[PDB]
Amino acid sequence: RTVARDITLLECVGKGRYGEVWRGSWQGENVAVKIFSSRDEKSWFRETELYNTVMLRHENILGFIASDMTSRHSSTQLWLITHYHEMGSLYDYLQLTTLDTVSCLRIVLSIASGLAHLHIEIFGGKPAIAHRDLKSKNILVKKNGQCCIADLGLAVMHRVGTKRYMAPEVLDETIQVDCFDSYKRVDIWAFGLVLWEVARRMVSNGIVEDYKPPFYDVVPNDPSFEDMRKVVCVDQQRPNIPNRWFSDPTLTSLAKLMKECWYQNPSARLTALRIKKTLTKID
Ligand SMILES: COc1cc(-c2cncc(-c3ccc(C4CCN(C)CC4)cc3)c2C)cc(OC)c1OC
Ligand SMILES: COc1cc(-c2cncc(-c3ccc(C4CCN(C)CC4)cc3)c2C)cc(OC)c1OC
Ligand SMILES: COc1cc(-c2cncc(-c3ccc(C4CCN(C)CC4)cc3)c2C)cc(OC)c1OC
């Protein structure tokens, strides 16, 4: 039989220290192709090792297609091939889109659904998985209004995370590194920050906040480890909840939920399954 492996690379949709992401075409269908830098080869290995262990399949997890290693004259080329989401990342989408109640809840419940699926151990199934780099750039928007979680290059089964989204116990190096629940709790902190980023873009009473990243008002761009530790650990700052949210029942409920993802004590934070239940009872 013919094994068609040619992918046409049509446009670059992302370029970074990680390498590049391309929109590609295989057999007439769009695919996304991540081409890894030498800097980030271990992220290709880790995601590939995870998918060789457990073939994750969930509506709110970016869909795996292939891991390719190709020998070159003097280098190895590493590609990860996934489903393609033409609307791009949640980070992108929130810059120039505002949300209503239904769209805001659909987005955040779909993220919670993907995250709970990663976190849960299923027997007979999947190992429990923590993401370790959850953020709005690592979430893609689908045409049906749900999102999917991407980038399992730092994931752990039972490179450091983006500093702006690191939990206090990562910044103060008290995290219990031998305890898998510790990594779930780090993802929940980051989820709370994503929930704040999305909620700001939900309109109520004709008001909306501009898109801003978490801690935009207290750290520089590309904040250092120390910059983040002083904000999150020493001063114990948390993102601002605007007064206008307290006129709106949905944003009032989402403020409470994000507070319960941001406790200093990791074991006080809500679980992804409890976040899902709370979100299903809003509106
Ligand atoms: C090697 O590399 C790539 C391969 C492919 C690809 C292309 N055509 C057909 C296939 C195929 C799938 C599955 C079987 C099964 C049939 C049932 N039988 C019991 C066992 C074998 C055979 C063939 C593949 C996997 C695409 C690629 O990119 C999209 C590849 O590069 C990453
Ligand atoms: C990697 O990705 C894609 C792959 C393919 C593809 C191409 N040739 C053959 C297959 C295949 C056929 C048959 C089995 C068997 C397995 C055992 N049992 C006996 C029943 C079923 C498995 C695999 C596939 C899945 C198509 C795709 O899209 C249309 C892919 O997605 C981009
Ligand atoms: C986060 O991480 C990964 C993401 C992806 C991925 C999947 N679908 C679509 C995209 C994408 C497409 C298009 C735009 C732009 C272009 C057109 N318009 C002007 C605005 C929107 C942005 C983004 C990506 C980047 C794949 C990955 O791996 C193959 C990723 O890594 C795991």
From Swiss-Prot:
Record EC number: 2.7.11.30
Residues of the full protein shown: 202 to 499 of 509
Protein name per Swiss-Prot or TrEMBL: Activin receptor type-1
Function per UniProt: Bone morphogenetic protein (BMP) type I receptor that is involved in a wide variety of biological processes, including bone, heart, cartilage, nervous, and reproductive system development and regulation. As a type I receptor, forms heterotetrameric receptor complexes with the type II receptors AMHR2, ACVR2A or ACVR2B. Upon binding of ligands such as BMP7 or GDF2/BMP9 to the heteromeric complexes, type II receptors transphosphorylate ACVR1 intracellular domain. In turn, ACVR1 kinase domain is activated and subsequently phosphorylates SMAD1/5/8 proteins that transduce the signal.
Family the UniProt entry places it in: Belongs to the protein kinase superfamily. TKL Ser/Thr protein kinase family. TGFB receptor subfamily.
Keyword Nucleotide-binding carried by entry: yes
Name of the gene encoding the protein in the UniProt record: ACVR1
Cofactor: Mg(2+); Mn(2+)
Keyword Membrane tagged: yes
Reactions catalysed according to its record: L-threonyl-[receptor-protein] + ATP = O-phospho-L-threonyl-[receptor-protein] + ADP + H(+); L-seryl-[receptor-protein] + ATP = O-phospho-L-seryl-[receptor-protein] + ADP + H(+)
Gene source species: Homo sapiens
Enzyme class: transferase
Predominant location category: membrane
